[PDB]
Amino acid sequence: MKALILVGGYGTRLRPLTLSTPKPLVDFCNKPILLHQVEALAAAGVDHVILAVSYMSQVLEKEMKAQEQRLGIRISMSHEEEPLGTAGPLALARDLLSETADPFFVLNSDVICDFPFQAMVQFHRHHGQEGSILVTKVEEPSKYGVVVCEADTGRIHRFVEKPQVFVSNKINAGMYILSPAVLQRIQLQPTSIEKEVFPIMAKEGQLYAMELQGFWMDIGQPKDFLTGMCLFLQSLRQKQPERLCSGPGIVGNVLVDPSARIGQNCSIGPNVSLGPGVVVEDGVCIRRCTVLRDARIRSHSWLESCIVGWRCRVGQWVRMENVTVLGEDVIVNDELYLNGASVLPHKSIGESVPEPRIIM
C-alpha cells in the first residue's frame, strides 16, 4: 500500500517562510510537517511514499533521502518541471500507482492533525467504492467549501465550493484514499483534483466521507500556523505530557529543544515552540510564538503571536504582537514595535511598524 504526498512548491501564504525553504520543510513544533506526515505514515505501515514536486528542491531531496535511509521505508521522487497542480501529480506518478490494484492514500502537506490511517482503511473497506474523503468540523462555514454527508453511510451527495448557504457543517480535511480507476480518470494536464475530479465523482456519488474526532488544522496561513501550533501543543499535553518542558518560569504547554537555551528570570508563556539552538536571554516574555532554529531573542523583549524565522536577531526591548512573521536572517534593532509586520528575509528593521504592512 502506497501513499502520495502533494509537496510541489511555493506555499503562497506564509510567504516570508516559504521564500527561504519550501513549505513542507518549515519547522512545525521543532520538526518539518513532511516529517510528521511520513512519520505517521510509517507508523501506519505504508511501504513506500511518493512525493510530487514541481519546484526544484535539492535541499528537500537531501532531507528526504536522509529520511528514507533514517526511517526504513523507501521514498520515490516524482519530479515535474511545469506546475502540474493537484491532480496532475497523480497522473505523472500514474504507472506506479497502477502497478498494484490497491487503494492509495493522497495527502496534502499543509494539514496537521491526528492521523487515523488504519481507521480510514477500515472505513474504505467498509463502504467499498472508489474514493474516500476525510471531513472535519469547523466553526466558520463562510471560509471553506462545505460538504454534505448522509448519516450511517457518509456518502457524498453534493460537493459545494462556495459558502453562505449553510447546507453543511463539514469541510475537506485534505486526506483522500483513492482507487486506481480514479487515477484512470485523471489526465496529465495541470488541473486541480478538488475543483473538477472530486466534483464529477460527487456527481456520480462515488465519494464517501469519514469524520475525524478533533484537532484538525490546515496551517498554510501564518495565523492558521499559530492556531494549529496551539492545538498541537494541547494534543501533545494530552498524549505525551513528559515531552513538554516544565519549569518555574514556564507557563502552559511549552516545548523546547534540548539545543535551545533559556536565560535566567524570564516567563515563557503558553503555547510556544522553541527551535533547536535558539538563545533566549534574560527577561524575555514569549507567549503563543514559534521561534525557528538558531534565532537569538535578546533581553527584555516581549513577544506575542509571532513566527520568528531562522537565524534572526531581535534586539532588546522589542515588542512584537499580532501575528508578525520574520523571514530568515532578519535583524531587528533595539526598542522597536512590530504589529502585523510580515518582514521579508535578510532585512534590517530600524523603524517601528505600528500597523500591519509588509516590509521589503
Place this chain on the structure above:
Amino acid sequence: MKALILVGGYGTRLRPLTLSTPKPLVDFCNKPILLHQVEALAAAGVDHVILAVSYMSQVLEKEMKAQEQRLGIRISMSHEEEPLGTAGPLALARDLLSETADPFFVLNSDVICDFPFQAMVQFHRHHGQEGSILVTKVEEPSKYGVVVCEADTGRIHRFVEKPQVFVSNKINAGMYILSPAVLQRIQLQPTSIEKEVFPIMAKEGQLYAMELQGFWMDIGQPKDFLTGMCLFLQSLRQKQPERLCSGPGIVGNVLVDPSARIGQNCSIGPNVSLGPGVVVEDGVCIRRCTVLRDARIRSHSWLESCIVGWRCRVGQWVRMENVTVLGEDVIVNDELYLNGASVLPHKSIGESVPEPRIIM
C-alpha cells in the same frame, strides 16, 4: 590593471526582481547590469575583473564563466560565507590586489552611467594620491550623502553622510580608484567602506573627486530603475540611434530585442525596453515600461511606468500604472487595474489593486 566589483548579496530594493535572480543579473535594456559593467571594463582594457559574492549564486558563476570565455578577459570569483558588506570584499581578495602595485577600480553594480575609465586613470595619475572618487550632480540633495569639492584640484575636505545642510551639490557615483595602501588599511570585519574607511581617508584629506558629465543613475530602486532606463535610452539615442527600433506604431526611444514580437495596431510609447522573447499582442499601449524576457502581454492592455518580470502573463484590458513591479511568472487576470502593486513571484492576481500595496 584590474577591477573589483561589489556583486554579492540580495539587493533589498527592487525585491520583486531580486527574489528570482540576483540584482546584477536583472536585465537592464535587454542586457544584465553586470554585462554592462564588465563590457565597459573590457573596453577600458582591464586584464581581469574580480567580483565578490556572499550570496550563493551558482547561476551567476554559470553566466560569468560563459562571459569569461566570451569577452577574452579572466574572471576571478571571491566567495564569502557570511556577509562581509562592501569593505570586507576588499579584504578577502586582498592578496590578489596586493600582487601588483597598481591603482585598481572598485565598482558598485547598481550604478549605470557612461563610464569614463581612462579619464579617471588620467585624473588619478594627475592628482597622484591614495584614493579617487567619482562624483555627480543631483536635483534633491536631501536624499543622498554630499561631498565637498575644491575647484581645480577636486580634493575632498569633508564627507557628509547626512543631508539637509546644503554644503555640497555633489553625490558619490559608486566608482572608486584605490591604491594598495587603502587595502592595507582595510580589515576583514564586515564593515562597509563608505561608512568608516572613506571617512578617515577624507579626514586625512587623502580622497580626491572626479566629476561626471551627465547620465548617472543608481538603479537599486524600481522607480530609479525606470528613470535610469529612460536616461539609458536617451543616451543610446544620442550614441547609437540606429540600434533603437523605429516604426509607424513606435513613439520615442524604444529598444526591442530581435526575439521580441509586437502585434499589429498597437502603440509602443516612449522609453520602452522589450526583452528577448516577449509577445506584445494586438492593441497594447506600453509607455515607460521595462518588459523582461519571455513575458506575454495580451491584447488591449495599457501599461505605463512598470516592470514586467520574467514569464509573466498580463491579461486582456489590464491597466498598470505607478511602478507596479511584477515578479517572475505572475498571471494577471483580465480586466484588472494595478496601481503600485509590487507583486511577489508565482502569484496569480484576480483582484484590482487601487492603492500601492504589496501582494504576497
